[PDB]
Amino acid sequence: SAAYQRTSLYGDDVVIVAAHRTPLCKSKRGNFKDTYPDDLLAPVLRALIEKTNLNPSEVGDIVVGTVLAPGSQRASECRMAAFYAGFPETVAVRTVNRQCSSGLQAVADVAAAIKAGFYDIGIGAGLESMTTNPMAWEKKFAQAQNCLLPMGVTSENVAQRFGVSRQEQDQAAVDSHRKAAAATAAGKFKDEIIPVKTKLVDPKTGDEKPITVSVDDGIRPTTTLASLGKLKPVFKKDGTTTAGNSSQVSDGAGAVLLMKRSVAMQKGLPVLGVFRTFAAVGVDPAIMGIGPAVAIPAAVKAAGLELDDIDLFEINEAFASQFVYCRNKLGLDPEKINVNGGAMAIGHPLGATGARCVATLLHEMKRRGKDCRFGVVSMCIGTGMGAAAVFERGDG
Template identity: 80%
Template sequence: MEKAINRQRVLLQHLQPSTAASAPLISASACAAGDSAAYQRTSCFGDDVVIVAAYRTAICKSKRGGFKDTYPEELLSAVLKALLDKTKLNPNEVGDIVVGTVLAPGSQRATECRMAAFYAGFPETVPVRTVNRQCSSGLQAVADVAAAIKAGFYDIGIGAGLESMTANAMAWDGSVNPKLNEFKQAQDCLLPMGITSENVAQRYGVTRIEQDQAAVESHKKAAAATAAGKFREEIVPVTTKIVDPKTGEEKQVTISVDDGIRPETSLSTLAKLKPVFKKDGTTTAGNSSQVSDGAGAVLLMRRDVAMQRGLPIIGVFRSFVAVGVDPAVMGIGPAVAIPAAVKSAGLQIEDIDLFEINEAFASQYTYCCKKLELDPTKVNVNGGALALGHPLGATGARCVSTLLNEMKRRGKDCRFGIISMCIGSGMGAAAVFERGDAVDELTNARRIQSHNFLSKDAK
């Protein structure tokens, strides 16, 4: 608030009449409000990138849950179709569909995603591509579409995420280059994710009880959100089949509820679990994210295009940052990415009202929250991956839907939200969103015909 008042004071000084008789009526000078006013410069323009719809499937336990017998492309087609059905958008107007996905063979998954678009009702003229930045792939897809819209490549696009960890396991294919032995950081890229969790816990002093407590809270909050119907708006029911492994009998089911949440989880039950990755470690199956299946999709467009179509603006894409960190402690990624994304949006961490931080492991999630000194009442208010699950490529897109729906429920008390996650091999990503109806009422959205060459402050 103090920074905003100071900027207003500086700007008002520019409007004061000069007392010197010889002073020119108009003079050029650098504005002291300058680049510190990054967010205020772009608060509401017709070329804002906005989100008008964001949906996800339920998240189900791999190999045992509701989607264990569902083709991956069926999950993606369900959320893509939901975007069309619920917005009545003409599919011919979509400039691109970008899908974040991690584990499946690249060319095969790219083809499956193209097939999913056809199943959902998109014509052959709409292109599809995949993107893989591991655990941030779904968010990266959304960011890629936002960047393309901002660049003027097209006005409407879809960022999505898909993962079936039932169909595709985490495994290394082929041999490893012996050159690896000469580079410690390259070696650390191959560390099991659970070992990186142990490294974070040991290096930064995160205790076993802190990790178990984070898991208990995640399940508790996710169970409460489910009971209150908070996920109903964002989840697209998927009608599929379940095959009995003993008899082979098929049964048709409709999956509309996350099936990994355990409301009865307690510290006493988690304390009985043995470490999985290290004999004397603290990372267990109970304080690690669940291996899951799921998909999500986000419809983005220019603000003026959304307004012309009368579509609800549920969020505004404000910034995105990906950073690199030490692969041995890849879980610290959000602690580095969040401040960078907030700064890029012209904000401070204190301005953020809600955080969705992926709970890959309780150790890294706990560390990041403590490092950034986040208010626990603002973080993962409806639970996270420890309870819901973490379908790698889909998580980022799922978080967009969860965040924006919660921001909408909170209304004027919640203006800015952030999504962040750590990334295997040592990275972090974060994106800042603004609630869709939180724009300055004194500023009218205007159509931007083309890019101009005014200075940033003039804009």
């Protein structure tokens, strides 16, 4: 049960024509340590346009989920991004009004706006970068664990309160890396990922190496049950959460190009996905961090569907405790979730999570064929909320 719900029903009207992401790199010294935020979001926004041959002025709204950026810095980094991607003055750029969020509502509110007829083309996107461009348009560490410290004590509570332990939590982490490695090795991310040609300063000598990033650098294929249960608990004393069974903050961007179905047809644009429904729920405050498990059946029901109808699931793996609960509580087939790895392996790009997961889902749906008809993207909007989105495989 939910204290309240927001339900958006999109019908068959709202289609996705492009969904892309940068690779994700670990924020601490990872491969984006010398790339500024707009240099992450800009190629993703540019990729949507290029894939669709669209005049950037036709885009009605860009909404970006972003957590790390303090105060006004949020919008100015996104405006930079949109400017360098070739969007004019007139294309409005908005951030999501949340202290802490994974940015799935950015896609949902773009879709809602199209549904209500406010404009015909929109972009829902997300960005996180620990770096700061000295060149401003016209603290970040604090904001990060500000979202993660409350998130970590709740999922550890849910673990003690529901009986989730190191065991399943670690197993989930092993699986995540196994699946992320297998995906990477098999080239399954090639389609969704937009390579980022940046620079990397070498700590030993300080020279700038030209670099193209193509791979998520947080995947650790040598992870097993063995080495994980060697790191000490990260929060509590006898806490089951580790640096191994929780995701660390990653730099990256994602973006989703949404439009009304009739405008995609006349533009000769293949439909990647159909945005069916979105539910956002307020959960029981005495059991926080269980958001996804209330939001999933709420969104699936609004799609006029059953849990078993859903072929794929993208559920955020910020914490294995949290992730295992939701899977087990809903009795989901673990073969259908994060089939190509999750946050624990490829990184947790906070506000870029929502757009990241949409790209991963839809492209895997694209690859799996017509029988992979229904997908779910689910995550929190802070500890006290759950958000889930239902997507149908688009027809190409």
